[PDB]
Structure 1
Amino acid sequence: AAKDVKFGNDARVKMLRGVNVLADAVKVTLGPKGRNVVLDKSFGAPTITKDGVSVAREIELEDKFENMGAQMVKEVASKANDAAGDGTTTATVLAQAIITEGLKAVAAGMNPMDLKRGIDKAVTAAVEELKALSVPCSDSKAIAQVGTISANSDETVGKLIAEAMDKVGKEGVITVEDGTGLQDELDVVEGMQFDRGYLSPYFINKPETGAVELESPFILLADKKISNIREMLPVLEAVAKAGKPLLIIAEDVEGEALATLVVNTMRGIVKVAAVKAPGFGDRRKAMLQDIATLTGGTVISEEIGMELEKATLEDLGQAKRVVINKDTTTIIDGVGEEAAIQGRVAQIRQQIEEATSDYDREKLQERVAKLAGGVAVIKVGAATEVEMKEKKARVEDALHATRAAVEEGVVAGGGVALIRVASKLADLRGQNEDQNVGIKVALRAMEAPLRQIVLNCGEEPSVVANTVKGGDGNYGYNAATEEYGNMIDMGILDPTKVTRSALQYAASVAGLMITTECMVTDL
């Protein structure tokens, strides 16, 4: 339609106003003294959340240019959540700081593309320095502390994540689920996990988490590809009568003749989903057989000659809970048979003892790790649904933070790591003066997380920032106890991946936004 076109400082201040609205709503949640945000939901009760990305996703403005800025900066929280699942508030705070300082430099007549280049150079240097001063979470062994910090100083959540990592392994699969009591529970049970996603965007359930849940579902397995509808239509009727939702693990499924027909068949009463099969050839068949044995099902094949028309409900597999996400799909609890599971584990161990191929060896080691470790389910204890959603979000944040910590390491929390890397980059220079000003903009924005943490505590951010900058190493400000000390010793640890990702995404988006002179939107 007809477009409103704005130029220069008018467009820039409107975009900054939108960025500020989103970033203020998100930044009120930063740190231990960060507060909560109520998001009105079109379905049911409002959501109370301390998660930056949840607040960011819900922000949309009446003013179109302000909304444009809000959406562009909301991309920062979205990317931070997608990458690290944590630090979305920090990423938003950093993006707002870079935007504000860069727009100030633009108003000083400097070339915004050179400012963007300086910001990018500073952020590359800072990512290198973050890697340099990162400390492995195996050496530090503070997975509980990382989980506690990421769960808003909830020591019980961090202890639970630490116990789950001690039980199913630091790389084992852990899933956060809604509990039934008022207490958080940890249950290590038998399950399977494969890194595959749903093949239909309309499969998403009523919750907007992006992943679908199947309660006591029906597992279907097939290594070959079927053509005719009427061949497996009686199987569709049998599934429709089993009472348990259908999850199909096949090589690949379209939506032209299967998803469209079923979506025109239902109004949404039963959630039927299909997933891809990791690997190919012999590996796909062997993983399918393992999944069938875990769930008590069977896998059809051309060589076997078994047809789906003769398949019964008892022949097919059954589970208790399945979580299907784009990144990773996990069958949480498949009944199957414990003796069968143990026998399959022993058989795969014997196969390891037999085979010698390097790729086969590593895939068999992955298989035995998946089977022996099982899954660990953390049931969130909460008296109400709003408390359940809040605590589950915090536990998922702690889970993501602990995974990122054991993957990439830890650094001093409370914004201290960014302060230290900015201090180490004081002598960084660019090609020209505008690049140097962009570098200074990035370095000053690197203090914004600590300053916002301190602002949320009601203290004076400049004094605390100066005291931290005057220190060295992991010296910083415990905002919970409102006192200075060694951040590592006090247990305030941030995953290096979370900090690095927040900085990188904030920098990319914000540096792009400071280079804008014109904005085109609808009237």
Structure 2
Amino acid sequence: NATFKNKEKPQEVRKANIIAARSVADAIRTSLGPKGMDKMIKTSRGEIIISNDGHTILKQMAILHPVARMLVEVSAAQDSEAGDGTTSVVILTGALLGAAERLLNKGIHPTIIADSFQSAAKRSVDILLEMCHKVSLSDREQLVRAASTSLSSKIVSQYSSFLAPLAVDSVLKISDENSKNVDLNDIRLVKKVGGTIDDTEMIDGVVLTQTAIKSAGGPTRKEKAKIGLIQFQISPPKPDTENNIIVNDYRQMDKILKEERAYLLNICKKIKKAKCNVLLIQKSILRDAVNDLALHFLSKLNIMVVKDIEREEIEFLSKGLGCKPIADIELFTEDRLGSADLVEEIDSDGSKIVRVTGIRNNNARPTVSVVIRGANNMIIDETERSLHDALCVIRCLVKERGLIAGGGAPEIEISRRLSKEARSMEGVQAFIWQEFASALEVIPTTLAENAGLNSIKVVTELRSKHENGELNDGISVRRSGTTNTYEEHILQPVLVSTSAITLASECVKSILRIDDIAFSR
């Protein structure tokens, strides 16, 4: 026949948008699952990396297309809210965009597509909630099992029996029962080489990466301490401008040397007058945090000094200990000091790690630090990496309580449910809902492919088995087939699946609404 000509062709932009975005999603798709494939990336600086980390791939993918880059923000939002599923949400987005492309080819306006997909997404969330197996954050065993399970894909899985409950106590210290949103940024992970994995502590205070006094005579440990934050540098005067000094006798140079020493001492003495026991000095590249001579003078004053403390560490000190930043030297006063019962440096196989513990003050805030030890860099890195994931899994259990079986289980169930519920819909919504349900299958399809299994066979077995089961049937790479998701311990927090449905739908909404791009300079 013949229909609207649309001499102006914004559809060319919508096509380019979907084509570019689906290409990114199809690329990352191959990395889904414990059996997923690795990628090689040569970066713009010439360094070549191999990784299967979804976010790292997209970050180093160097996406240029103005719309496809949205999938990077999707993986960031997934990592920010859930902390897991950063690959799945991108794959789902791609499949939904493919569904949108077919709908566009059928003459469905992108406004209709976006609105109908949102309605289907709302039902998917409800279905996920119905499938949840509820847990309580008061039941440490439920949380340890959830954390240890997610850590089964790590290089060292055996020590999860100890790292998992550490993550639980770290979260519960900040996730009291009457809460929903838990901010894990209050849990600082501080690592040093030395010791082994078991030698890991959950601390109710602030732990630093920096050492105590290096100079002779320093106390290096204070009890019943008042703690100040120094943002100024304690160093001899070194003006950046021009100065012309004439020295004709050694007596003049001695006066100059006395000026440098007296300056450092005068600061040290003024600090002591504030009754401060521990000096925690912010790192700066302008001048040295504390001169060697200042450490000598401060040591004689029985003051403990911790130099070159990172900016982020200062933010943790100023929240936990009750201490406040001190911008300048004359502003150093008692009112700016915090509280701690003991400040000490611990030397565990040369760890040289400083800990501030025992605030014992109403200024205490729910800050958490973790002390990570291990002989090799790989030991402390794998410990840190494992705790980061364990904390995110537990956070998910607090925000949206319960776990749902993995292996594509909710994707098969939701697809079947929406396929049947669509039968109650009319018009474009009925057809679009069917396309949404079909798009969901990209996940159990991809998992079957990467596991070495026949795609159609695995997906077909799951769809039929869900006639009797709900969440118990899914893909197990361990058993290389469709088996019992619970007996195989294949569990994913509700928040992760819920976030993937929401964010993928929001991305498709955002992409379909783009009909043009203009330059602005």
TM-score, normalisation: structure 1: 0.64
State the identity as a percent.
Answer: 18
Counterpart secondary structure, 1:455:
helix
Counterpart secondary structure, 2:200:
strand
1:36 equivalent among 35, 38, 41? 38
Matches of 1:182 and 1:461, distance apart in 2:
47
1:162 aligns with 2:164: yes
Matches of 2:434 and 2:451, distance apart in 1:
27
Give the superposition deviation at 1:415: 2.0
Counterpart secondary structure, 1:428:
helix
1:335 equivalent among 355, 366, 370? 355
1:16 aligns with 2:18: yes
Alignment of 1:219-298 (within 5 A): 220=228, 245-246=281-282, 265=286, 273=311, 291=321
Corresponding residue of 2:96: 98
Matches of 2:144 and 2:419, distance apart in 1:
34
Give the superposition deviation at 1:411: 0.2
Corresponding residue of 2:473: 475
Structure 1 residues 495 and 460: alpha-carbon distance in aligned structure 2, compared to 1, 3 A threshold: same
Give the superposition deviation at 1:113: 1.2
Structure 1 residues 477 and 61: alpha-carbon distance in aligned structure 2, compared to 1, 3 A threshold: closer
Moved more, 437-446 or 487-496: 437-446
Moved more, 80-89 or 130-139: 130-139
Moved more, 22-31 or 495-504: 22-31
Structure 1 residues 60 and 308: alpha-carbon distance in aligned structure 2, compared to 1, 3 A threshold: same
Structure 1 residues 38 and 490: alpha-carbon distance in aligned structure 2, compared to 1, 3 A threshold: same
Structure 1 residues 299 and 479: alpha-carbon distance in aligned structure 2, compared to 1, 3 A threshold: closer
Matches of 2:377 and 2:46, distance apart in 1:
17
2:59 equivalent among 57, 60, 64? 57
Matches of 1:125 and 1:400, distance apart in 2:
25
Matches of 1:30 and 1:403, distance apart in 2:
23
1:396 aligns with 2:426: no
Give the superposition deviation at 1:427: 3.6
Give the letter aligned to residue 59 of structure 2.
R
1:37–1:55 CA contact under 8 A, matched in 2: yes
Corresponding residue of 1:464: 458
1:192 aligns with 2:205: yes
- Deviation per residue, 1:219-261 (Å, 9 max, x gap): 7459xxxxxxxxxx999987xx9996518xxxxxxxxxxxxxx
1:220–1:246 CA contact under 8 A, matched in 2: no
Give the superposition deviation at 1:482: 0.7
1:84–1:498 CA contact under 8 A, matched in 2: yes
Give the letter aligned to residue 477 of structure 1.
I
Counterpart secondary structure, 2:57:
helix
Corresponding residue of 2:500: 502
1:176–1:392 CA contact under 8 A, matched in 2: yes
Moved more, 406-415 or 160-169: 160-169
Corresponding residue of 2:410: 417
Give the superposition deviation at 1:48: 4.1
- Deviation per residue, 1:254-304 (Å, 9 max, x gap): xxxxxxxx78x47999675379989xxxxxxxx979715xxxxx6699xxx
TM-score, normalisation: structure 2: 0.64
1:192–1:291 CA contact under 8 A, matched in 2: yes
Structure 1 residues 145 and 35: alpha-carbon distance in aligned structure 2, compared to 1, 3 A threshold: farther
Corresponding residue of 1:130: 128
1:511 aligns with 2:509: yes
Counterpart secondary structure, 1:477:
strand
Corresponding residue of 2:5: none
Structure 1 residues 158 and 319: alpha-carbon distance in aligned structure 2, compared to 1, 3 A threshold: same
1:451–1:461 CA contact under 8 A, matched in 2: yes
Give the letter aligned to residue 488 of structure 2.
M
Matches of 2:86 and 2:463, distance apart in 1:
24
Give the superposition deviation at 1:507: 0.8
Give the letter aligned to residue 486 of structure 1.
N
1:150 aligns with 2:166: no
Give the letter aligned to residue 203 of structure 2.
E
Counterpart secondary structure, 1:411:
strand
Structure 1 residues 79 and 168: alpha-carbon distance in aligned structure 2, compared to 1, 3 A threshold: closer
Matches of 2:133 and 2:77, distance apart in 1:
24
- Deviation per residue, 1:46-93 (Å, 9 max, x gap): 55433212222222346xxxx123212222111111111111101101
Corresponding residue of 1:447: 441
1:216–1:319 CA contact under 8 A, matched in 2: no
- Deviation per residue, 1:185-235 (Å, 9 max, x gap): 4512424379xxxxxxxxxxxxxxxxxx9545997459xxxxxxxxxx999
Give the letter aligned to residue 273 of structure 1.
R
Matches of 1:14 and 1:467, distance apart in 2:
36
1:85–1:401 CA contact under 8 A, matched in 2: yes
Matches of 1:161 and 1:175, distance apart in 2:
15
Counterpart secondary structure, 2:487:
coil
Aligned CA-pair RMSD: 4.8
Give the superposition deviation at 1:506: 0.7
Give the letter aligned to residue 136 of structure 1.
K
Structure 1 residues 113 and 182: alpha-carbon distance in aligned structure 2, compared to 1, 3 A threshold: farther
Matches of 1:377 and 1:492, distance apart in 2:
30
Structure 1 residues 114 and 80: alpha-carbon distance in aligned structure 2, compared to 1, 3 A threshold: same
Alignment of 1:337-352 (within 5 A): 341=358, 345=360
Matches of 1:14 and 1:99, distance apart in 2:
12
Matches of 1:464 and 1:436, distance apart in 2:
27
Q: How many residues align?
A: 413
Counterpart secondary structure, 1:425:
helix
Matches of 1:75 and 1:500, distance apart in 2:
17
Query: Which gives a bigger RCO, structure 1 or 2 (Cα 8 Å, sep 6+)?
Result: 1
Give the superposition deviation at 1:432: 5.3
1:414–1:453 CA contact under 8 A, matched in 2: yes
Give the superposition deviation at 1:95: 0.6
Matches of 1:319 and 1:440, distance apart in 2:
63
Structure 1 residues 94 and 380: alpha-carbon distance in aligned structure 2, compared to 1, 3 A threshold: farther
Structure 1 residues 168 and 147: alpha-carbon distance in aligned structure 2, compared to 1, 3 A threshold: closer
Structure 1 residues 58 and 395: alpha-carbon distance in aligned structure 2, compared to 1, 3 A threshold: farther
Give the letter aligned to residue 485 of structure 2.
M
Structure 1 residues 9 and 412: alpha-carbon distance in aligned structure 2, compared to 1, 3 A threshold: same
